[PDB]
């Protein structure tokens, strides 16, 4: 109730009580009024955050090293037009099959929690997670930092959520910068730092 709010002096929506990690009461359109939509949106936000962080790393770290000359990798924008050892549709089909198996078990855990926690082949192996969206276990949590007191869990999940939101914004920014300026994302930063007054849209 006394948590910081996105709009100081306003009243947060009723369905946002601050229990969820990274909660600031921002929901002007009320897209998650009923609980089912709230759970679905939480899962979607977590997935989007993690995918976006991976994408941001894979876009920005390779492009940084290419500019300074350690590697000679192509642009992320045109990385899809190179020729590889096989046709792109074959890679797309392999990806579709593998990620369909991977995400299929994730869909079942959302609908019916606690039903896909056992290894189909070797029953001796199990996932130790208890929350939807945080599978846990040795496969996904080898270091054992994913379990503990509620305060630690809330702090870690808030950190993850905020970092994921920042990564989503950064990825969208990089895409639009390459669309408009027609130049690599790292070049834009150096151009801005050269003439901060004038290096602008």
């Amino acid at each position: 109730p006394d948590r910081p709010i996105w709009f100081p002096g306003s009243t947060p929506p009723e369905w946002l009580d601050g229990s969820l990690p990274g909660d600031f009461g921002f929901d002007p359109l009320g897209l998650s009024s009923d609980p089912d939509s709230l759970k679905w949106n939480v899962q979607a936000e977590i997935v989007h955050c993690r995918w976006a962080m991976l994408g941001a790393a894979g876009i920005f770290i390779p492009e940084f090293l290419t500019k300074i000359g350690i590697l000679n990798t192509p642009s992320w924008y045109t990385a899809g037009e190179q020729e590889y050892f096989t046709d792109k549709t074959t890679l797309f089909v392999v990806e579709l099959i593998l990620i369909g198996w991977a995400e299929g078990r994730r869909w079942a855990d959302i609908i019916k929690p606690g039903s896909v926690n056992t290894d189909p082949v070797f029953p001796n192996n199990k996932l130790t997670g208890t929350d939807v969206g945080y599978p846990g276990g040795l496969w996904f949590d080898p270091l054992g930092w994913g379990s503990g007191s509620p305060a630690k869990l809330k702090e870690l999940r808030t950190k993850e959520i905020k970092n994921g939101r920042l990564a989503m914004l950064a990825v969208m920014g990089a895409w639009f910068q390459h669309i408009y300026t027609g130049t690599g994302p790292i070049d834009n930063l150096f151009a801005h730092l050269a003439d901060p007054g004038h290096a602008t849209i």
Partner: protein, 196 residues
């Protein structure tokens, strides 16, 4: 028994008392018990025919790797000449299969009503299930436990899928089934359903 899709609840009419029951019926064809009774026999017969068909399509073609015999491929065997015309063989097959399938059909309606030989009255099949005749049809006296029935049904389903693959592949590729496997094994990453 097992679940064809974890996280989804099995239908109530699939109680697991049948062999090879994995609770797979998304479209609800077997809601009526009579429909399930008919479809079990239909699946059994279709699989039993499909396994023999697949064995007759694949094995008489693997000769090329061994070079023992010389037989045309499965889609060209019809055009070959034989000691009798197609019409006579078709008529004889019709005449025999009519009696065979009419005899088989009567057991589904009234089980235990066709267990006695029609000519030699002292010969009869021992009582059994509807789709598992036994008796003379089981000369080696293998015990028909549930495990063997599940193995039979799994093999039948796999053979149905194999026959569908055999039919579809020839239509688009124009060759037999064994050379398609060899072509794939030559360059796996370039020879798939995606030709490019």
């Amino acid at each position: 028994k097992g679940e064809w899709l974890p996280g989804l609840a099995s239908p109530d009419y699939l109680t697991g008392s049948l062999a090879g029951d994995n609770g797979f019926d998304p479209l609800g064809l077997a809601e009526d018990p009579e429909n399930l009774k008919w479809f079990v026999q239909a699946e059994l017969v279709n699989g039993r025919w499909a396994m023999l068909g697949v064995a007759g399509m694949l094995l008489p073609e693997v000769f090329t790797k061994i070079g023992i015999i010389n037989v045309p491929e499965w889609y060209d065997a019809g055009k070959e000449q034989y000691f009798a015309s197609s019409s006579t063989l078709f008529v004889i097959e019709f005449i025999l299969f009519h009696y065979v399938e009419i005899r088989r059909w009567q057991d589904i309606k009234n089980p235990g009503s066709v267990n006695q030989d029609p000519i030699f009255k002292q010969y009869s099949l021992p009582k059994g299930e509807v789709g598992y005749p036994g008796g003379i049809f089981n000369p080696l006296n293998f015990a028909p436990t549930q495990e063997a029935k599940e193995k039979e049904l799994a093999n039948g389903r796999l053979a149905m899928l194999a026959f569908l693959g055999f039919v579809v592949q020839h239509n688009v590729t124009g060759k037999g089934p064994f050379e398609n496997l060899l072509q794939h094994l030559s360059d796996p990453w370039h020879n798939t359903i995606v030709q490019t």
